[PDB]
Amino acid sequence: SIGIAVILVGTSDEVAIKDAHEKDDFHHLSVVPRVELVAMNETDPKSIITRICDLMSDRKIQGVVFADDTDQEAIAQILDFISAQTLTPILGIHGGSSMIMADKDESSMFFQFGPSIEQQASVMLNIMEEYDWYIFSIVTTYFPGYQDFVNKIRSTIENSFVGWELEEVLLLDMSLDDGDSKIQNQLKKLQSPIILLYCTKEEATYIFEVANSVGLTGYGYTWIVPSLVAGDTDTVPSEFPTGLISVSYDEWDYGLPARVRDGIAIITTAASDMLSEHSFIPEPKSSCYNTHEKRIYQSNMLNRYLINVTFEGRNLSFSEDGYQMHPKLVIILLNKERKWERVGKWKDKSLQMKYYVWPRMDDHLSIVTL
Amino acid sequence: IQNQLKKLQSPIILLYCTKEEATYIFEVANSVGLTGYGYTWIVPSLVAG
Amino acid sequence: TVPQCCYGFCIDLLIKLARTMQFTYEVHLVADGKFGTQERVQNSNKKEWN
Amino acid sequence: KIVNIGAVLSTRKHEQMFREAVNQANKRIQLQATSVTHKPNAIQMALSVCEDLISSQVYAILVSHPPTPNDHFTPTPVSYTAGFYRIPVLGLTTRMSIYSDKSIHLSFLRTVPPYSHQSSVWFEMMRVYNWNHIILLVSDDHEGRAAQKRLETLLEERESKAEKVLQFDPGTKNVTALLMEARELEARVIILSASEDDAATVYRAAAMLDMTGSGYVWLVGEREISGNALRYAPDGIIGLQLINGKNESAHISDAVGVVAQAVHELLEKENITDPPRGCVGNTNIWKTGPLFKRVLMSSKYADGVTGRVEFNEDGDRKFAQYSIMNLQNRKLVQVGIYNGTHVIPNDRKIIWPGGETEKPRGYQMSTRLK
């Protein structure tokens, strides 16, 4: 009898997903979930909060599934705020709510499908290990998470038997006005054919313009960037050099055909497991106004039951931080033409490439032996 | 000039230019910074004037 | 922990060292039985000597 | 033009004081006043915040802690609503360390020093007293871990670590094991940093084990002095306190002055775009507000009622003042003032634990080796 709402914003296949929602197989459980398809425009945080409040106060809402289509990142912060102020868990599966926030509050109940930065750093190291690239360098600017990335890459390079070599790690800063001289004097010490870059879109374009003014991006230099530099795979800033390799989430194979269905199934099976084990079902008066008296019920055991679910032969165990920890990552690269062509797929801790040798794009002579 | 002077790796440099050209290349090298501690440059008798 | 008695080169060396340095001591054997090496386990928040 | 000022406090007298302050600031270019009280609930608080931002369209908002003693979750809705549109929000009476991190809050500046920089005062006091050996015993939490990391970095800067580090679970009932382990070391200086509730139990268990005799020096923070912890406190504690901690109007006047200086330095810039008055309408990031925050953080204040106030690149006030309080026979007495970088004592003397009057060695070189 749990209430679950599905909110959509912007342009999307509203009728298609509304028809697909009535295709769940929940006959082997006594859940009878109240489903309410609500569609509107992502106008502002206030309207979103008001709609959430109204739908929750309508009829005993015990869960919220969210999907968006905009590019705003603060919407995830608003969702975290809501899930912190009221103990009803929510799930952001697609849209603006796909921006992963690592520093969440203690009493928050929010889980997304975004991959952790450590997972991306491990994937981009497994790629180098499968490509036999034992020489690399690190360049990054002032950003909330660069230190964590450096610490993770150091922890994963120090605890491995394969001989690697870190050389000339920099901490350049482009925020200083007229700092082109410092950037040019700092980037002049790079001597590795593999570069790891972690910056922002504007900072990435600026450092790429600087490196192209220098010229270490044409033939043999191959740079790798995490999933925050891309932003949108449809547009190209035209400043990114050729032969760029990045990692992203598998959204082209499944935008939202069954993501909402999987989320609803996970919520239902977790509620059923909690009701079976703890012999209790959380269904209080989910009201927005005058909720200070409703702080007698805690959702810690529910969270303890939400991070252990396995359905349809797939691992969905989340982590305490709030990411999936079992995603299906893909490996894309920027070829001659301005585009992102998918090449490899990384799922279930396994790698699956497409080309036996990496395309290099004279002094490249093959050799026949016996 | 900045992309060309970035390949110098010798502690002794031989320079042969004109007074204005010498001042310009010295300003460039000081913007880079290879003239302070260990780099010793030698110039012929036409740079002094 | 059964109380045994030890004797040998290092024993009398430590005796002379404590005599010339004028202090007291309370010896005890090794816990695991190894000189010492790095123990690299996946163990993300763990790295020490054994 | 007509640019109002934003401030959200809960007091009629403080509201009138802020009105007079902004009037005097405008007298020193038309600046209006916009003030909203505090609500018991925070969702309605954020709703009213967006409503007031719609009805006023302010550049930056001021916020202070209400008379409620929590001071933890009160400014979080305001900070979230500010960061949703990338506009700066300044705090007045909030000293939590979670706000110091720029990850959660992209734009947030405080006017009081955090507990992390308070640990540096302990470093200076140990340096001027020649106390190289210390026993850092703190709790296990976000603020505790941040303070411990700051102290460890400031100690390792001088190529010297801590003698021992002990952590206990907050909200516990038995800490005899940690005290027994600490009492078998060579150091005689025990630093403490936790909440007022834990300090009483810590002092009780310490006095129960005769760990408060002569030769031991205790160091705590402002939070471990006030509250009911004062009932269980040995004589000779050297604590700290803020000069304008509970005085809101003193900080409000300086905040009004610095924000007036900021807007006066701002209105003479190009490409000025006022934030949209459409809280419900707009869905993008205002072109102004990030740059305004950047120039406000670097805006060196002229003068204030609390001295020259500066700000580092962390959203925290620098070069503050602390009252070095002490406990002498159940009677609080001041010993000196921390004037930015120098500790100047008064004519009075210090009464160390046990009754002796002499600088303790803080290092007992007992000779019983293993």
**Measured between CB atoms, which of D40, D44, D84 is closest to A74?**
D84
Q: Is A168 annotated as a binding residue?
A: no
Give the number of C-alpha atoms closer than 13 A to the C-alpha of residue A81, restricted to the C-beta side. 30
Going by beta carbons, is chain D in contact with chain C, meaning 3 or more pairs sit under 8 Å apart? yes
D301-319: buried (b, 16+ CB within 10 Å) or exposed (e) per residue? beebebbebebeebbbbee
Query: What SS3 class is residue D285?
Result: coil
Nearest to A73 by CA among D285, D137, C1: D285
Q: Indicate yes or no: CB of C24 within 8 angstroms of CB of D369.
A: yes
Q: In this complex, is the C-beta atom of D331 within 8 Å of any C-beta atom belonging to chain C?
A: no
Alpha-carbon span D245 to D257, nearest angstrom:
19
Q: In this complex, is the C-beta atom of D370 within 8 Å of any C-beta atom belonging to chain C?
A: yes
CA distances D364 to D130, D184, D188, D192, D360, Å, are 14, 11, 7, 20, 10
Enumerate the residues of chain B whose CB falls inside 8 A of the CB of residue A215.
Answer: 3
Alpha-carbon span D185 to D193, nearest angstrom:
20
Which residues have a C–N gap over 2.5 Å right after them in chain D?
28
Amino acid found at C36: G
Q: Indicate yes or no: CB of A70 within 8 angstroms of CB of D283.
A: yes
Give the neighbours of chain D: at least 3 Cβ pairs within 8 Å: A, C
Q: Indicate yes or no: CB of D283 within 8 angstroms of CB of A103.
A: no
CA distances D268 to A186, D255, D273, Å, are 35, 21, 13
Q: Indicate yes or no: CB of B32 within 8 angstroms of CB of A185.
A: yes
The answer to whether A27 and A58 have CB atoms below 8 angstroms apart is no
D109 secondary structure, DSSP code: B
Nearest to D59 by CA among D304, D251, D295: D295
Pairing of the two strands D189-193 and D135-139: parallel
Largest Cα separation within chain B, whole Å, is 29
Q: Who contacts C8 (Cβ-Cβ below 8 Å, separation ≥6)?
A: none
Overall resolution, Å:
4.1
Residue C24, φ and ψ in degrees, nearest 5: -120, 165
Q: In this complex, is the C-beta atom of A159 within 8 Å of any C-beta atom belonging to chain C?
A: yes
Alpha-carbon span A183 to A75, nearest angstrom:
35
Alpha-carbon span D213 to D216, nearest angstrom:
6
The answer to whether D201 and D228 have CB atoms below 8 angstroms apart is no
Alpha-carbon span D159 to A72, nearest angstrom:
45
Residues 117-176 of D with CB under 8 A from A: none
Query: Please, where are the H alpha helices in D267-325?
Result: 290-297
Residue in C closest to D366 by C-alpha: C23
Amino acid found at C12: D
Beta-strand (E) ranges in chain D? 2-8, 30-36, 61-63, 89-91, 135-139, 164-168, 189-193, 217-219, 238-239, 310-311, 317-318, 321-327, 332-339, 342-345, 368-369
Beta-strand (E) ranges in A27-160? 34-39, 61-67, 90-94, 110-112, 135-140
C18: distance to nearest CA of chain D, Å?
A: 10
Alpha-carbon span A133 to A124, nearest angstrom:
11
B24: distance to nearest CA of chain A, Å?
A: 16
Beta-strand (E) ranges in C1-50? 24-25, 38-39, 48-49
A315-346: buried (b, 16+ CB within 10 Å) or exposed (e) per residue? ebebeeebbbbbbbbbbbbbeeeeebeebbbb
Enumerate the residues of chain A whose CB falls inside 8 A of the CB of residue D103.
Answer: 102-103, 144-145
Nearest to A118 by CA among A226, A231, A195: A226
D238-263: buried (b, 16+ CB within 10 Å) or exposed (e) per residue? bbbebebeeebbbbbbbbbbbbbbbb
Which two tokens mark D97?
A: 């360390």
Residue in A closest to B4 by C-alpha: A214
Amino acid found at D255: A
Q: Indicate yes or no: CB of A46 within 8 angstroms of CB of D40.
A: no
Rg of chain C taking only CA atoms, in angstroms: 16
- Please, what is the angle between helix A146-158 and helix A117-130, to 10°? 40
Enumerate the residues of chain A whose CB falls inside 8 A of the CB of residue D85.
Answer: 74
C27: distance to nearest CA of chain D, Å?
A: 5
